[PDB]
């Protein structure tokens, strides 16, 4: 069915849905711990999404390092309110329900089955079609 | 060198061309006869190609008049042809050249202006050219017989004199002719903010008169509405003009809300805290029409963005606006009635809950509490805007229309809402759907006609029959007017005042049946 | 300078569609001077803001107030005088969209610039003259300070 | 500053202040209008003086003296437009309100009042009330 | 109307070309009628392609499976070369037309030069060529994508490479692959007018039977009986 | 009256757009008209196609051997493809 046969599964799928929420904030030690497990990490700590009153990184900000290359993707979270695409807040999302990967960076949205699962057009599918099987293998392991 | 070898050929082109003798022929002939050469063959060239098109026209036009066809058809055809040729070939530079050779256009202009079509020609020519001297002079002078807004506001004195004359006509217009008397003034005021501020300040000072200045205040609010329609924020105008300066918090809050053309929980919270304080600012301060329309579209369109912790705050401020009695002891609020507040807020709350729930059958379920609660006027306005936006959806009549019944409670129980209800149904009487066929469109139209006849029975008779006359003269087929007369003469009891006959019977001349029509015509002519 | 934009805003709504994230609120703010509409997601937990507040906003290309490029990398040990010292709330994001009212015939009069500070989204709508510093896929710093 | 006012207000089709005028002004310019207020066409002078209103209340309160002097200049221009906007807007930059005893020896305002005073007095009968009265309960409505 | 508005290139409104293209390209487009005839021919063959799609897809379903994701490749071209869509582009429309033409020459499924091989080549890549000409039309390339010359060349190279990577490799046991790909969903197929479905129906289709459980005729009507319930 | 081996005939308007009468209006837009279809039990395709005021083009069966006997080998190829595509895609799953 010209789609990925394997996607992200139970615990890590629920946990990455919770991780890429808009209000996930990680302090310095937490991100320094998490980047240990990122095999493809180039060793540069990204600039935090919030510098003052305290350095904090977003879950999407850390996940953007997991996304390889410069792939670009558009999907919708499972709880995407249809009629959001018609309202004034089209390209800004109140519920953060539209996932937009841009140049290998997750700039908005909450990932779920509809963007990391086995569905055709999912992020892992585009990762395979663009970066090849090896980089997608590393992408899977790093997400896990 | 001598231009003879070129200018003589320039003239001979207009001599030997087919058919030019009848003209600048004199000027070119003078340029040639002074240039010498062969002037004898010039006349032969002029008359050689004289095809006698003019006498051909004599024969043809007099034969069309021989045919018994109306010659005024020929007049309209010739006028349309020549006027269209002028408009297609009008040059503003040459109009200004006619101005340059002499300031006042010679008698050809003053003979054209006697013709209505040429007066309309000059209107369309000069309404778009605010700097062409001929065109500006013509439009201004014809106004002395549209006054162009650029020359209306070019100085105080012209603006003031046209302003006061036009405002006198508006006040003479009563409550109907303002529609024609106000725009010519309003669009004149709505061109600049300085002419604006001046006219608004004049109308504000005029409004202090208790001998009708309420109407000048009304017209000032209407001009402010139009200034908003031209995309100009007159918020701070109304602030510094009214008693906003008496309360800076209410000033900044309200003015921000008006400048955006929308509400917000912040300014609303400011006003809520102000009216929750022991010194509530004046209820006149918030009683502004567009502001209350913002309340309507916040509480009665689907959406807008809303919090429950502020839903009641919007509701309570609107209740304070619609309920509280402040008595002025020489501009001193000394007695504050807030006793008819809580019931009004409760009714507004329940009705807004229903309206923003996007109700039909559930309306009929709680129609008891509705017609209990429409007795509140502000609630009646809110339901009116809600049912307007629901029913104004394209093809809302193919799926439930109970909503049209509710106007019966509104208009009957609130006299001053007669103008809104008819001015709602004027849109609905023009409903047209390809899905709901012309049969169903006529069904809905006849239903709305019954509503308009009921509203006529409440006394709103002059504008009803005037618009019925206008749409018959236009749109409204003779079947609809006959059904109008059927329902009317089936419900209206004699005597019939001539203020109603003067429009109802001379449009009833088209038909004679619905026999009650014969009785009506005989009684109202005898 | 490196300041793409500066203004003073006032919060006209806090969380309009109802609370959807227990630490983040979508402020809607107006500007009195430039008359820009602002939507901005703010982490209220560390920087609590309530309704009717006022604050200076600044969108800057860099923080070192010398034109020196930031390098887009976290350096906790920076001796250069940072502009962030004059502000309470500092976020770092990327402009990812610049819409406008342009037609194929005429340029835009009104522009809407969208920025994503790690997920926290901002839109800034207003006249095009004040948003000429914004260009897509460029990094920006949002510097916000409450005003008394 | 004068050519700056030209480049921000050169368009004569807009006789209004441009939206966001305080931003299309600057506090430096709020002070510096006095240098070349009388240098532009009178239309531009008017648009500037009217732009004074949309500026924030506090920003005007800080530079109230500058707008006071600018209105004093506005009361001198030959075009009566500038004279009456100065007359109306004398008090705003420091008080926050406008003049309202505006029959101020201007024969044009004298014509307006001398006609419309008695015209309104004649038209008191069936004088269409403001549009606020529709939404109010009967007690305040009568009061 | 919408198709012509969105796809037919306009070379008669100078303002649009100034907004979308650099002034030298605008003068080049407006000056000579050769390029204008080329763009007219482009739109005409796109209209022919539209009719071909209409007869192929009578149900109007635009979703279709194809090798190369042209929109994603255009987006990657935009974000690799930092295309600014706010500025006029430097890409000739004629260069777009000739580039898509030579690219379509390069995409070969069946090779040869006799009429039979050429016709089979046209038919094999008909739908993808239609999609390519519609997606990379100079109208959309100049209006909404705004790609530069180097970006467009990179895009053509990537389309060529990915298409050549998409051709079926010889020796692949497509029979077994089809058998497994059609046998796997039978393990998920269950059973809930009333019509037989699931693995009984699949059985009967493969196990071709003279006795259907629920034989039927979805018979259609054409006259007024199609809409008239009484006549039906 | 009636053709044998036809024990029941259900008449209905399909609300799903797949069986709706899809046309291209003069503007070039796809419009899905709602038209009555009849679905029967038991098949005699030659007879029902031979009937009067019956669409002889769109009328089809779910019985593949009937299609082969009456229409041919390419017709039953296409009909078999559509039938097993239907039974696969009925549950929402997709296969190439």
UniProtKB/Swiss-Prot annotation, chain B:
GO cellular component: membrane; NELF complex; nucleoplasm; nucleus
Keyword Membrane among record annotations: no
SS bond list: none
UniProt keyword annotation of Cell division present: no
Tissue spec: Widely expressed. Expressed in heart, brain, lung, placenta, liver, skeletal and cardiac muscle, adrenal, thyroid, kidney and pancreas.
Result, substituting residue 329 to M: Reduces RNA binding
One GO-annotated biological process of the protein: negative regulation of transcription elongation by RNA polymerase II
MF term (GO), any: RNA binding
Subcellular location(s) of the protein: Nucleus
Coiled coil: none
InterPro entries per record: TH1 (IPR006942)
One Pfam family named in its UniProt record: TH1
Keyword set, alphabetical order: Nucleus, Repressor, RNA-binding, Transcription, Transcription regulation
Effect of mutating residue 330 to M: Reduces RNA binding
PANTHER family from the UniProt entry: NEGATIVE ELONGATION FACTOR C_D, NEGATIVE ELONGATION FACTOR D
Its job: Essential component of the NELF complex, a complex that negatively regulates the elongation of transcription by RNA polymerase II. The NELF complex, which acts via an association with the DSIF complex and causes transcriptional pausing, is counteracted by the P-TEFb kinase complex.
Quaternary organization: The NELF complex is composed of NELFA, NELFB, NELFCD (isoform NELF-C or isoform NELF-D) and NELFE; NELFA and NELFCD form a stable subcomplex that binds primarily through NELFCD to the N-terminus of NELFB. Binds RNA which may help to stabilize the NELF complex on nucleic acid. In vitro, the NELFA:NELFCD subcomplex binds to ssDNA and ssRNA in a sequence- and structure-dependent manner. Interacts with ARAF. Interacts with PCF11. Interacts with KAT8.
Family note: Belongs to the NELF-D family.
Protein name (Swiss-Prot/TrEMBL): Negative elongation factor C/D
Primary gene name: NELFCD
From Swiss-Prot, chain D:
Record-given protein name: Negative elongation factor A
Keyword presence, Nucleus: yes
Tissue expression remark: Ubiquitous. Expressed in heart, brain, placenta, liver, skeletal muscle, kidney and pancreas. Expressed at lower level in adult lung. Expressed in fetal brain, lung, liver and kidney.
Keywords assigned by UniProt, alphabetized: Nucleus, Phosphoprotein, Repressor, Transcription, Transcription regulation
GO cellular component, as recorded: cytosol; NELF complex; nuclear body; nucleoplasm; nucleus
Provenance organism: Homo sapiens (Human)
Similarity section: Belongs to the NELF-A family.
Domain comment quoted from the record: The HDAg-like domain is essential for transcriptional repression, and mediates the interaction with the RNA polymerase II complex.
Predominant place of localization: nucleus
Function: Essential component of the NELF complex, a complex that negatively regulates the elongation of transcription by RNA polymerase II. The NELF complex, which acts via an association with the DSIF complex and causes transcriptional pausing, is counteracted by the P-TEFb kinase complex. (Microbial infection) The NELF complex is involved in HIV-1 latency possibly involving recruitment of PCF11 to paused RNA polymerase II.
Keyword Protein biosynthesis: no
GO molecular function annotations of the record: chromatin binding; molecular adaptor activity
